[PDB]
Design a binder for this molecule. Structure first.
Ligand code: HEC
Length: 108
C-alpha cells in the first residue's frame, strides 16, 4: 500500500525463495508457470509477450507501480479475484519493500 525503498540484496534472496519458481526477470527470459516479469513496472497487467493470462488478470488492467504491486503481493487472490496460482502472498511489509526495491531494478 505504501512502498519505501529497502534492501535489494535481501529482495534478490526473497525473489529466489518466493518468486523464481514461477517467474523470471530478464529481458527475453522464459515464462515458467507465471509470466516473465521484464518491463512489468509502468505497464498494464496481462501484457507479458507470449504468456496467456486468466480473464481476471487481463480485466484488472492495473498500471503496475510500486504501491499497487505491494498491495497485490500481500494477497494476489484478494487484489485480483479469479487469478489462478499456488501463491498466497508476501505478508511482511519489510519483505515487500525489499522485494520491490530489487524487482524495480531487475526488470528494467
Ligand atoms: C507460482 C506458484 C507463483 C509464485 C510463487 C508467484 N507467482 Fe506471480 N504469478 C503466477 C501466475 C500463474 C501468474 C499469472 C496469473 C494469471 O491470473 O494469469 C502470476 C502473475 C504475476 C504478476 C502479474 C503479471 C502481469 O500482470 O503481467 C506479477 C506482478 C507477479 N506474478 C509477481 C510475483 C512476484 C513478485 C512473486 C514472488 C513474491 C510471485 N509473483 C509469486 C504464479 C506465481
Amino acid at each position: 500500500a505504501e512502498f519505501k525503498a529497502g534492501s535489494a540484496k535481501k529482495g534478490a534472496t526473497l525473489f529466489k525463495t518466493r518468486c523464481l519458481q514461477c517467474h523470471t526477470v530478464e529481458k527475453g527470459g522464459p515464462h515458467k508457470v507465471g509470466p516473465n516479469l521484464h518491463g512489468i513496472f509502468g505497464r498494464h497487467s496481462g501484457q507479458a509477450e507470449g504468456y496467456s493470462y486468466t480473464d481476471a488478470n487481463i480485466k484488472k488492467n492495473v498500471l503496475w507501480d510500486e504501491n499497487n504491486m505491494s498491495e497485490y503481493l500481500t494477497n494476489p487472490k484478494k487484489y485480483i479475484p479469479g487469478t489462478k496460482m499456488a501463491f498466497g502472498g508476501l505478508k511482511k511489509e519489510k519483505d515487500r519493500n525489499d522485494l520491490i526495491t530489487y524487482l524495480k531494478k531487475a526488470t528494467e
